[PDB]
Amino acid sequence: AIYADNSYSIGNTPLVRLKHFGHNGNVVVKIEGRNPSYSVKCRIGANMVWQAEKDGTLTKGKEIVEPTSGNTGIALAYVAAARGYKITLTMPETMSIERKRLLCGLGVNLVLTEGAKGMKGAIAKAEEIVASDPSRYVMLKQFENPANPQIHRETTGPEIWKDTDGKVDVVVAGVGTGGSITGISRAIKLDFGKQITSVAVEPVESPVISQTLAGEEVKPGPHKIQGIGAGFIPKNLDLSIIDRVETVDSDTALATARRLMAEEGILAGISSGAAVAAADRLAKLPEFADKLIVVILPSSSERYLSTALF
Amino acid sequence: AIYADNSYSIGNTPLVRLKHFGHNGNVVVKIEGRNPSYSVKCRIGANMVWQAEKDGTLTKGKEIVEPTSGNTGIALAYVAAARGYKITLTMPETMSIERKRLLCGLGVNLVLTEGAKGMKGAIAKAEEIVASDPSRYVMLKQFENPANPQIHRETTGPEIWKDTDGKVDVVVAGVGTGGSITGISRAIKLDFGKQITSVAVEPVESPVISQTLAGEEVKPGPHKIQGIGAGFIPKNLDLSIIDRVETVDSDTALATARRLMAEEGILAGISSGAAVAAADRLAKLPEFADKLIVVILPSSSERYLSTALF
């Protein structure tokens, strides 16, 4: 069991039962912080690169270009270093010094865009760089790349099946790309044939999945629950497998993350608090009393030291 | 496989083969960053508490008091929160705001000592608090507590045996408490009967193990390789099982940690770079050419963002 590089070490993350949430230990958490670059995204960083290699879109000498400095950026940086690809990440010039230093540390070619242009500016610039030499540059496209949910179908979902001996009844996950909830859900429902309840979590400030499914006007808004609430329905969110949508507000998500730290001794990120708050709400409905609820905690706390968490 | 609290989730950390160090892949690293609170110390935080419980020194209502804010402090904070103990950590008032916020986040009662007094002040204060109500307060004493090396004999060492199918020939580890090298060494040499080479790593700036074994004057010095080089021989360093001592300087340790990041896509801490630099030196001696060298990387990189690493 020696990994040939750090990309292959993804996953096998542990399940920890919560003591101060749910009812008689019905809430259980999957610690995705225990990963090569400390987020759930390492699984997709790995698989998107592996997949582009197998299909010939990524070859020796080609360079990766992605508009991200979040978990996905960090994940692709580590994979690119592990597997010997150059990588450029585009991002607004107003990003954190810590994040700059971290990505630069991982050997990323950092391309800062105009502050004023925000995400839009960074995405446009990524596309511009690719356009300039399409045979040289490859954008992996986390929101739409099927390799994203597929890795969760092959690893994250079977890990949950196995660690629960098939007893999982409910999976609760925040939605960014939708990869986690989609892949996990397909694994449990389709590969293992169990009719669980799949619960998507989104910010009440930007409840676009809830609005969409209700046939209402889609109205995104700002929130502080980083990693989720992208403000649109991503292609990697298979709405067909979603049974339920829970909205959580930023303050509750933050307070819940602090509670996980101080009461459970679990170092999770803001989105982890959002996911647990939703799971805790379900866990205290009588309908979920005898049900084992498994919650994805996407990231670890030291990543949020600069933020409102602390 | 559901842990009853986060203390039980320790270990099972992965081995990753290095591409840009050693010779024909003879250097392999154990990623101790993949742990509940992101260091090797979580194993001892867990076991010292478990052991004090089993021997009746830690009971419901008693409070932990330790002079540490490093990895051990963070480790005990998470265990104390997971298992429902109050904890006070003493530390110089000049410690980092990040570290203050992190420990405070974990629900620690932080006791700041006089800047001028440094470590000495914090240790004295810990002892003072314990003295004031010895039936209330318990100090676990990482430098001398046998539960420290014992956890490494029971988990870390057998993990290395198993992941290498008994092929490990050399274990390289930096020494702080000496727990890692001691426990691992006892496991492999005594429990599994293989005559490996155990290599302690210390800073050339404070080479007290080298001085001691040579019968020379012991002369500690400041260095930046955090986690090692305590400036004395700790009781939990079993010198009997040490075959070799490698000294590494701070700059090389730092540059080596940056190389691990940028060339291997491994997010390790300063002491991880020190340990790899020593292993790389051994790995390029012909005597170690056909030998599998396993190196402990104690911590992950985001813990060193404020530091000289970045």
Which residues lie closer than 8 Å to B307 by C-beta, 6 or more apart? Answer: B224, B226, B270
B34 appears as a binding residue in the annotation: yes
Separation between Cα atoms, residue B80 and residue B62, nearest integer Å: 11
Sign of the Cα pseudo-torsion (A73, A74, A78, A81, in order): positive
Would you give the DSSP letter of residue B1? Answer: -
- Give the three-state DSSP class for A174: strand
- Residues of chain A neighbouring B258 (CB-CB closer than 8 A): 105
Pair of tokens at residue A225: 């629950």
- Residue B63, amino acid: E
Burial label, A216 (beta-carbon count in 10 A; 0-12, 13-18, 19+):
exposed
- Helix, strand, coil % in chain A, rounded to nearest 5: 45, 20, 40
Sheet containing B109-113: which strands, arranged edge to edge? B109-113, B87-92, B63-66, B137-138
Please name the residue ranges forming H helices in chain A.
42-54, 71-83, 97-105, 118-132, 147-151, 157-163, 179-186, 208-213, 250-259, 270-283
State whether residue A97 sits within 8 Å of chain B by CB. no
Subunit contact A267:B163, Cβ cutoff 8 A? no
Q: Count CB atoms within 10 A of the CB of residue B157.
A: 26
B180 appears as a binding residue in the annotation: yes
State whether residue A166 sits within 8 Å of chain B by CB. no
- Residues of chain A neighbouring B300 (CB-CB closer than 8 A): 38
Sign of the Cα pseudo-torsion (A242, A246, A252, A256, in order): negative
Pairing type for strands B109-113 and B27-31 reads unpaired
Gyration radius of chain B over CA positions: 19
Which of B267, B242, B255, B257 shows the shortest CA–CA distance to B173? Answer: B242
Chain B stretch 270-289, residues whose beta carbon is closer than 8 A to a beta carbon of chain A: none
Closest-CA residue of chain B to A2: B15
Which residues lie closer than 8 Å to B190 by C-beta, 6 or more apart? Answer: none
How many Cβ contacts (< 8 angstroms) between chains A and B?
Answer: 156
Q: What φ, ψ does residue B19 adopt, rounded to 5°?
A: -100, -30
Subunit contact A3:B15, Cβ cutoff 8 A? yes
Please name the residue ranges forming H helices in B164-302.
179-186, 208-213, 250-259, 270-283
Sign of the Cα pseudo-torsion (A250, B6, B295, B299, in order): positive
Pair of tokens at residue B220: 């500690």
Per the CB < 8 A criterion, the answer to whether A68 and A91 are in contact is yes
- Helix, strand, coil % in chain B, rounded to nearest 5: 45, 20, 40
Separation between Cα atoms, residue B277 and residue B250, nearest integer Å: 11
A271 appears as a binding residue in the annotation: yes
Chain A stretch 121-140, residues whose beta carbon is closer than 8 A to a beta carbon of chain B: none
Rounded (5°) CA angle B119-B224-B276: 125
Separation between Cα atoms, residue A288 and residue B36, nearest integer Å: 28
Q: What separation in angstroms does the CA of A61 have from each of A53, A94, A138?
A: 12, 31, 11
Pair of tokens at residue A39: 């987020």
Unique residue bearing structure tokens 């197998």: A54
Per the CB < 8 A criterion, the answer to whether B196 and B170 are in contact is yes
Separation between Cα atoms, residue B166 and residue B187, nearest integer Å: 12
B71 appears as a binding residue in the annotation: yes
Subunit contact B101:A305, Cβ cutoff 8 A? yes
- Max CA-CA distance within chain B? 58
Could you tell me the domains of chain B?
6-40+145-304 (3.40.50.1100), 42-138 (3.40.50.1100)
- Give the three-state DSSP class for B270: helix
Separation between Cα atoms, residue A299 and residue A123, nearest integer Å: 24
Unique residue bearing structure tokens 């991880």: B272
What resolution does the deposited structure have, in angstroms?
Answer: 2.4
Q: What separation in angstroms does the CA of A22 have from each of A223, A293, B8?
A: 25, 9, 20
Separation between Cα atoms, residue B66 and residue B140, nearest integer Å: 7
Cα of A15 to nearest chain B Cα, Å? 5
Method for this entry: X-ray
Pair of tokens at residue A198: 């799949």
Cα of B14 to nearest chain A Cα, Å? 7
Burial label, A62 (beta-carbon count in 10 A; 0-12, 13-18, 19+):
middle
Task: Tell me, yes or no, if B162 is annotated catalytic.
Answer: no
Separation between Cα atoms, residue A131 and residue A66, nearest integer Å: 13
Cα of A103 to nearest chain B Cα, Å? 9
Pair of tokens at residue A9: 């070490």
